């Protein structure tokens, strides 16, 4: 286990900001992806894990940026990327997501970089929106040593992610008409039999229901932070919040499996 920070509460995880000061920078020379912004804790008190976040088709860091400080303020290094092309497909997005985790591990060794020695490069996670969510699930299938995945409103050309052993939380948006839940997020969820998994559907949500500026940053943030802390840090203080079925009119559907209390 890698327990950092105080015992969480629902209200503290629903807050905009965790207990650590977040600083960030723009990656000078991106290696294998378009552009990156690294968010990191100054305060942590030990090495933190790293999470790479990828947007959807046509989209940029703006769509996913709110996760940077939301996670980093709880004890993570977060890299948000722009892809080489805004029109990159999920497999390319997965390659670039893993290239961003690689460059974070490089900057962990770069005496100049503000994140030298801050990363347990053995503790990494993947997130992303739509085709960047499908790319997160491809990253998890290809790299089972990843500790967690938390894609939002995912889309891929195949819904069969049966090889995934990585603890996977899928944020779904009930009224998604871009990647509908019944043909995308739910079949993807249903395919995984080998892992801790969870499915959280946002009541009334459009395809952007987990993007920067959304009307559920309390609940969605609580669940992303809790899932990453539980599985990236093996922090069982977070089992209650990671496995909980939220009592919320904001949630239209909840499913979970292999999520031990």
DSSP collapsed to 3 states, the chain: CCCCCCCCCHHHHHCCCCCCCEEEEECCCCCCCCEEEEEEECCCCCCEEEEEEECCCCCCHHHCCCHHHHHHCCCEEEEEEECCCCCCCHHHHHHHHHHHHHHHHHHCCCCCCCCCCCEEEEEEEEEEECHHHHHHHHHHHHCCCCCEECCECCCCCCCCCCCCCCCEEEEEECCCCCCCCCCCHHHHHHHCCCCCEEEEEECCCCCCCCCCCCCCHHHHHHHHHHHHHHHHCCCHHHHHHHHCCCCCCCEEEEEEECCCC
Residue with tokens 């948006």: 173
Alpha-carbon gap, residue 261 to 248, rounded angstroms: 20
35-41/76-82 β-pairing: antiparallel
Token reading at 243: 């496995």
Alpha-carbon gap, residue 190 to 134, rounded angstroms: 14
Q: Are residues 169 and 192 in contact, defined by beta-carbon separation less than 8 angstroms?
A: no
Which one from 82, 176, 233, 235 is the annotated catalytic residue? 176
> In the annotation, is 156 catalytic?
no
- In the annotated binding site, the residues are 57, 131, 155
> In the annotation, is 207 catalytic?
yes
Give resolution in angstroms: 1.4
Alpha-carbon gap, residue 182 to 188, rounded angstroms: 10
- Which sequence spans correspond to the domains of the chain? 1-261
End-to-end CA distance of the chain: 16
76-82/148-149 β-pairing: unpaired
Closest C-alpha to 133, from 86, 87, 178, 185? 185
Angle at 173 between CA 130 and CA 76, to 5 degrees: 60
Which one from 63, 73, 113, 130 is the annotated catalytic residue? 130
Residue with tokens 């819904």: 159
Partner residues linked to 82 by β-bridges: 35
- In the annotated binding site for poly(ethylene terephthalate), the residues are 57, 131, 155
Alpha-carbon gap, residue 109 to 103, rounded angstroms: 10
**How remote is the C-alpha of 196 from its chain's centroid?**
15
* CB-count exposure of residue 32 (10 Å: 0-12, 13-18, 19+): middle
Span 1-261: which CATH code? 3.40.50.1820
Residues with Cβ < 8 Å from 86, sequence gap 6 or more? 57, 58, 59, 60
Which one from 73, 136, 139, 207 is the annotated catalytic residue? 207
């Amino acid at each position: 286990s890698h327990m950092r920070g105080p015992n969480p509460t629902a209200a503290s995880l629903e807050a905009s900001a965790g207990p650590f000061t977040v600083r960030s920078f723009t990656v000078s020379r991106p290696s294998g992806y378009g552009a990156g912004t690294v968010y990191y804790p100054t305060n942590a008190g030990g090495t933190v894990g790293a999470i790479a976040i990828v947007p959807g088709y046509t989209a940029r860091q703006s769509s996913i940026k709110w996760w940077g400080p939301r996670l980093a303020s709880h004890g993570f290094v977060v890299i948000t990327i722009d892809t080489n092309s805004t029109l990159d497909q999920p497999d390319s997005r997965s390659s670039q997501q893993m290239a961003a985790l690689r460059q974070v591990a490089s900057l962990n060794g770069t005496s100049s970089s503000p994140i030298y020695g801050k990363v347990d490069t053995a503790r990494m996670g993947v997130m992303g929106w739509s085709m960047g969510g499908g790319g997160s699930l491809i990253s998890a299938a290809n790299n089972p040593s990843l500790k967690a995945a938390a894609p939002q409103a995912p889309w891929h050309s195949s819904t069969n992610f049966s090889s995934v052993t990585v603890p996977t939380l899928i944020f779904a948006c009930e009224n998604d008409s871009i990647a509908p839940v019944n043909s995308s997020a739910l079949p993807i969820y249903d395919s995984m039999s080998r892992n801790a998994k969870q499915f959280l559907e946002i009541n009334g949500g459009s395809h952007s229901c987990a993007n920067s500026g959304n009307s559920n940053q309390a609940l969605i943030g609580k669940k992303g932070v809790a899932w990453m802390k539980r599985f990236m840090d093996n922090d069982t203080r977070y089992s209650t919040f990671a496995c909980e079925n939220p009592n919320s009119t904001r949630v239209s559907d909840f499913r979970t499996a292999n999520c031990s209390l």
